[PDB]
Structure formats: structure tokens, C-alpha cells
Amino acid sequence: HVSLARGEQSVKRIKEFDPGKDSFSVLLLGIDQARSDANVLVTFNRKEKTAKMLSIPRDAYVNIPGHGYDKFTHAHAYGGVDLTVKTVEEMLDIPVDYVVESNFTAFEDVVNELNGVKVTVKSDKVIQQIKKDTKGKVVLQKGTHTLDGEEALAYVRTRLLRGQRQMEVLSAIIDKSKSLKMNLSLKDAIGLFPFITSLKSVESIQLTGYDYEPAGVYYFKLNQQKLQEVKKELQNDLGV
Ligand SMILES: CC(C)=CCC/C(C)=C/CC/C(C)=C/CC/C(C)=C\CC/C(C)=C\CC/C(C)=C\CC/C(C)=C\CC/C(C)=C\COP(=O)(O)OP(=O)(O)O
């Protein structure tokens, strides 16, 4: 339970935030300070009981406050969770109400504590790449299977985009739970659990763009029309 250096609520909110009655957002960060390799923002519409997930491309070309335009992934490296949150709020012009940061070990242990998570594997290409990645320690099979933590970790690490695999497994973890550092108390986290596990819909949205490589460093330049569309959708979802 770590607090952000920004106050009791997101500076982006114009009105007082009521955690238990308002729509809210959660930023999930996965780490191997370090760069963030999983960057998933989830917005929860309370009245509609819906969630929308968005993966921010790790190489997305964005302004990092205090550091200029750079890969999104570097925000956490330069200034930890606080700077990553600032970077997201500026990029999407929405509040990031909660943030959750997890490393490999926490992820694997969570999956194992849940007795694995269900994934429907569909690609021989992905299976072969994971075999290579893991020197054959992880051998997935096509079809619907329950993956242990080692297997799930390999699946979300291999480089369907990686961001999409991350969102897939994140939603699977939630489904299995029906059956690490953050900025809200465990009591509040647990208070949100019934809502989070009784959603009427779960959707994903995607930031599109193109490879931008001005001088031997790869960035992903965001399509600005799609970015504006995404911003409006998330702002509407949060009721801001
Ligand atoms: C699905 C949905 C609607 C909501 C789920 C998220 C929400 C809202 C949670 C609400 C708050 C709450 C109660 C949380 C309780 C905890 C809980 C149930 C889940 C916590 C989430 C969790 C365990 C992890 C979140 C992050 C995720 C999805 C995956 C972590 C992956 C990870 C640790 C690391 C990934 C690192 C990756 C992908 C690559 C690094 O590999 P590399 O550097 O060798 O290779 P490269 O550099 O060449 O690429």
C-alpha cells in the first residue's frame, strides 16, 4: 500500500471522487528503476457494470513529463509508478485512480495460488516461439487448458500482440478468482472485488499507429484520430 505523490485523488478529476459510487480506472504495471513491460489500463463503468481494457504499447512515442518524448516504457524507469501515472494521465487526458505494480514472481505465484488460469491456445507459431523462449521448459498445447504460473508467464512474455496476451490472461485471472504494490488498501481492494467479478461485459480497445524510427531507436507513433477516439470513449466511460 503505497500512496502516490499527487494527493488523495487524481489531479485530472474536476469534482470530488467517490470510490464506491463512481466509475474508476486501474493501471496495471508489470515489471521484470526498471522499465514497465506490461502496461494495461482498465476503466470500469459502475452504472453499466462494464470494463474496457487498453494495453499501452511499451514503445508508444509519448511525452514523459520532465524527460521529453520517449518510449512509454521508460517512464517507470525514470520516475517509477508516479511518473508512469503522470504519463498516462497526460497521454489519455483521464484520471488514473488506482495503480497496481507486480513483478514476475508475484504474477506466477498468483496464478499458482488460483490453481492455474484457463487459456485457449490457438497458434502453432506461438507454441513454437514459447518452446524456443524457454528452451523447451514450457510446451503449450492447442485448445482450452489450465496453465500454471510458469506457463502463463511464458505466454505473456513471448514477442496477436503481447499486450493482447497480457489482457487475455489478466481477464482469465479474474474469471478464475470468481471460481505486488498498489495505492489502495487491501480492504478497499477487497471491497471492489464483488463489483469487478460481476461485470456484464469486458471489452478491449486498441491504440493504432506506425513504426517510427528516426535514428536507430524504435518508437510506435500513435495514430492521432484513433487516440482522440479512445480518449473520448474512456472519458465518457469514467463520466468525466
Ligand atoms: C481483467 C480486469 C477487468 C481487471 C483485472 C485488473 C484489475 C482491475 C485489478 C483490480 C485491483 C485488484 C483487486 C487486484 C488484485 C490482484 C489481482 C487479482 C491481479 C493482479 C494483476 C497481476 C497479478 C498482474 C498484472 C500485470 C499483468 C496482467 C501481467 C504481469 C506480467 C509481468 C509480471 C511481467 C511481464 C513482462 C513482460 C510481458 C515481458 C518482459 O520480458 P523480457 O524483458 O524478458 O523480454 P523483452 O524485454 O525482450 O520483451
UniProtKB/Swiss-Prot annotation:
Disulphide linkage map: none
Top-level EC class as recorded in UniProt: transferase
Disruption phenotype: Single mutant has no effect on cell growth or morphology under normal growth conditions. Triple disruption of tagTUV genes is not viable.
GO cellular component: plasma membrane
GO terms, biological process: cell wall organization
The keyword Lipid metabolism is annotated on this UniProt entry: no
Residue ranges that the UniProt entry lists as topological domain Extracellular: 1-240
Bilayer topology annotation: Single-pass type II membrane protein
Keywords (A to Z) from UniProt: Cell membrane, Cell wall biogenesis/degradation, Membrane, Signal-anchor, Transferase, Transmembrane, Transmembrane helix
Assigned EC number: 2.7.8.-
Gene Ontology molecular functions: transferase activity
Chief localization: membrane
Pathway: Cell wall biogenesis
Compartment list: Cell membrane
Subunit annotation: Interacts with MreB.
Record family assignment: Belongs to the LytR/CpsA/Psr (LCP) family.
Purpose of the protein: May catalyze the final step in cell wall teichoic acid biosynthesis, the transfer of the anionic cell wall polymers (APs) from their lipid-linked precursor to the cell wall peptidoglycan (PG).
Name recorded for this polypeptide: Polyisoprenyl-teichoic acid--peptidoglycan teichoic acid transferase TagT
Gene name, Swiss-Prot/TrEMBL: tagT
Region of the whole protein represented: 51 to 322 of 322
